[PDB]
Ligand binder design. Structure first.
Ligand code: XGX
Ligand code: BGC
Ligand code: FUC
Ligand code: CA
Ligand code: CA
Ligand code: CA
Ligand code: CA
Ligand code: CA
Ligand code: CA
Ligand code: CA
Ligand code: CA
Ligand code: CA
Lengths: 142, 254, 75, 116
């Protein structure tokens, strides 16, 4: 910035493009050479895309050139960490964590089932044989 | 099977061998004590519906050991929609006259539910196919059960990636591709009716049946398998149905 | 139903986002990802978006080559 | 089967863009200046801790420094440069991440320029 004066004071990049905020010429009043001016200007003029606080759910925002990166807490994903991993427990997602059969229910949690000859353990996803020779196991290795 | 390995005795225990008057006909897959799944095309030229045996616990065709069980096939059930000399709807359901006895050497492959198969089994890349069929396209058949790991393709990728050819049948929604390919590669003549088996979280399921290919390993070509998932309801309904009096039976599909 | 097009990978410091066109009209997307010899893993289920964060899969092994595909379903 | 389309292949280690580096600090020791580049975090996590770019690429990654009438450059396979400078002259600095072995996306974008 430039008050009645201020400018009386010679070129600083301090107390002139940074304690305040400068135009492209206050920037070559200073650098003189222009690869040099462009180089400064690219990053200076870009601005903090993280100012809009796009990262949700406790994520941290790292500024880039004309973009950003959200770092997410473990239970989250998405560009803006918008996705709760815990709400994705549906049968199309790795079979719901079911070992055998998965059943989707609107209104409620997915329930796991087992093939004839197995029954479901207490953990709610694992199946165990209720007969001696169940389908689809190879006895000489079990 | 071309380019496969021996299946160590006992480690393909749901493989079935079908014979007609002592001659090797096709493979099959045991799904419980009295029911076997095979390929429709295996029966196109039979006319001795009582010279038709299933053998379970087979390994080496050249020695008989105590693990082999034989059974007479009581009934062969195919779709009404199947047409001899074509490739579509290539599936057969076989009732054994008496049950097999389940042993360390004789175990069924699980028939899965339709949705589990379509939504989960379909996206497991590698499945096993097995048989006593030709070791080479030319060449001879195997004495010891052979087995191979093949990767599954979606049909769109199978078309866009198979080498184009004047008179190859269409891949239908009742089929899926193997194999890749690249020649090493695949399954072959004499393996027909045999299983394509998929592992998932500790259990094995029938996902396919050896059906046809344009010859073997199939270069620029893939193996084609019956898409079992399409026939599950039809298999279950017939497995609870009342035995008709003839051997061969055309049941409506769907 | 239209097949997605212009599938594009946006990656910066392993933050990896698949993007595609078009904006969906009475159709939803599901994304699948695998390694060359691995199973297909489903992501971003039935989304109305035209992007999918795949970061959590790819960081499991950054030296693998991955393939993705985008599925179109009618609503 | 649903309509689908395939993506291009993607190898993260070779194709992810390098982010914008920043300069943490510089210090003077007589005629010599130390320039320290901040270790930029990635989304690769080793056990509830995000790894740096150095932790992932190690020796594959180098940082380049432009300082300044033309430009001089320095390289480092760490996060630090130790450069000679003239007394009583004020210098400006900028850094770029480079992975020399790469064929595409070899260079990050330049950092903000810092001056004494
Ligand atoms: C659907 C019709 C159809 C009809 C007959 C045959 C057929 C014709 C002759 C012989 C043969 O030479 N005799 C030996 C055997 C009877 C002990 C065997 C068969 C067979 O059923 O496999 C085949 C057939 O070759 N299927 C097939 C399966 C997989 C592949 C592959 N994956 N590359 C290639 C071909 C398909
Ligand atoms: C926050 O701001 C970013 C760009 O700075 C924008 O892309 C987001 O939509 C907003 O939430
Ligand atoms: C930035 O990173 C995320 C992952 C959280 O740890 C935040 O609290 C932190 O500030
Ligand atoms: Ca001022
Ligand atoms: Ca001013
Ligand atoms: Ca200042
Ligand atoms: Ca001021
Ligand atoms: Ca000026
Ligand atoms: Ca000024
Ligand atoms: Ca001025
Ligand atoms: Ca910025
Ligand atoms: Ca024998």
């Amino acid at each position: 910035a430039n008050a009645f004066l201020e400018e009386l004071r010679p070129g600083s990049l301090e107390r002139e493009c940074k304690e305040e905020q400068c135009s492209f010429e206050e920037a070559r009043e200073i650098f003189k050479d222009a690869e040099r001016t462009k180089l400064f200007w690219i990053s200076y003029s870009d601005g903090d895309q993280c100012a809009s606080s796009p990262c949700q759910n406790g994520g941290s925002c790292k500024d880039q050139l004309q973009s950003y990166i959200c770092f997410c807490l473990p239970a989250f994903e998405g560009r803006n960490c918008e996705t709760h991993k815990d709400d994705q427990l549906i049968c199309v997602n790795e079979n719901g964590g079911c070992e055998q059969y998965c059943s989707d229910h609107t209104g409620t949690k997915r329930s796991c089932r087992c093939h004839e000859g197995y029954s479901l353990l207490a953990d709610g996803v694992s199946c165990t044989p209720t007969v001696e020779y169940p389908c689809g196991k190879i006895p000489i290795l079990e | 099977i071309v380019g496969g390995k021996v299946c160590p005795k006992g480690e393909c225990p749901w493989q079935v061998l079908l014979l007609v008057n002592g001659a090797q006909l096709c493979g099959g897959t045991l799904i419980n004590t009295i029911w076997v799944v095979s390929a429709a095309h295996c029966f196109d030229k039979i006319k001795n519906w009582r010279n038709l045996i299933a053998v379970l616990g087979e390994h080496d065709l050249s020695e008989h050991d105590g693990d082999e069980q034989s059974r007479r096939v009581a009934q062969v059930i195919i779709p009404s929609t199947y047409v001899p000399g074509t490739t579509n709807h290539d599936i057969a359901l076989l009732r054994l006259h008496q049950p097999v006895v389940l042993t360390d050497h004789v175990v069924p492959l699980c028939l899965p539910e339709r949705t589990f198969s379509e939504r989960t089994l379909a996206f497991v890349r590698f499945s096993l196919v097995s048989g006593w069929g030709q070791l080479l396209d030319r060449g001879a058949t195997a004495l010891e059960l052979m087995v191979l790991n093949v990767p599954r393709l979606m049909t769109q990728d199978c078309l866009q990636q198979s080498r184009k050819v004047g008179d190859s049948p269409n891949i239908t929604e009742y089929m899926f591709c193997a194999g890749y390919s690249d020649g090493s590669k695949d399954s072959c003549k004499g393996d027909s009716g045999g299983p394509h088996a998929t592992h998932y979280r500790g259990t094995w399921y029938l996902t396919g049946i050896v059906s046809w290919g344009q010859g073997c390993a199939t270069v620029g070509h893939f193996g084609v398998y019956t898409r079992v998932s399409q026939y599950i309801e039809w298999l279950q309904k017939l497995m609870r149905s009342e035995p008709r009096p003839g051997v061969l039976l055309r049941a409506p599909f769907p | 139903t239209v097949a997605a097009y212009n599938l594009t990978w946006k990656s910066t410091n392993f933050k990896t986002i698949l993007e595609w066109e078009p904006k969906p009209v009475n159709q939803v997307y599901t994304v699948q990802i695998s390694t060359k010899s691995g199973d297909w893993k489903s992501k971003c289920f039935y989304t109305t978006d035209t992007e999918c964060d795949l970061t959590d899969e790819i960081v499991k092994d950054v030296k693998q080559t991955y393939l993705a595909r985008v599925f179109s379903y009618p609503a | 089967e649903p309509l689908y389309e395939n993506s291009p292949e993607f190898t993260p280690y070779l194709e992810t863009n390098l982010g914008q580096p920043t300069i943490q600090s510089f210090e003077q020791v007589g005629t010599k200046v130390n320039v320290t580049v901040e270790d930029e975090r990635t989304l690769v996590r080793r056990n509830n801790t995000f790894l740096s770019l150095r932790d992932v690429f190690g020796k594959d990654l180098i940082y380049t420094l432009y300082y300044w009438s033309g430009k001089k450059t320095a390289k480092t396979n760490t996060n630090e440069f130790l450069i000679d400078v003239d007394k009583g002259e004020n210098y400006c600095f900028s850094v770029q991440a480079v992975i020399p072995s790469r064929t595409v996306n070899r260079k990050s974008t330049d950092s903000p320029v810092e001056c004494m």
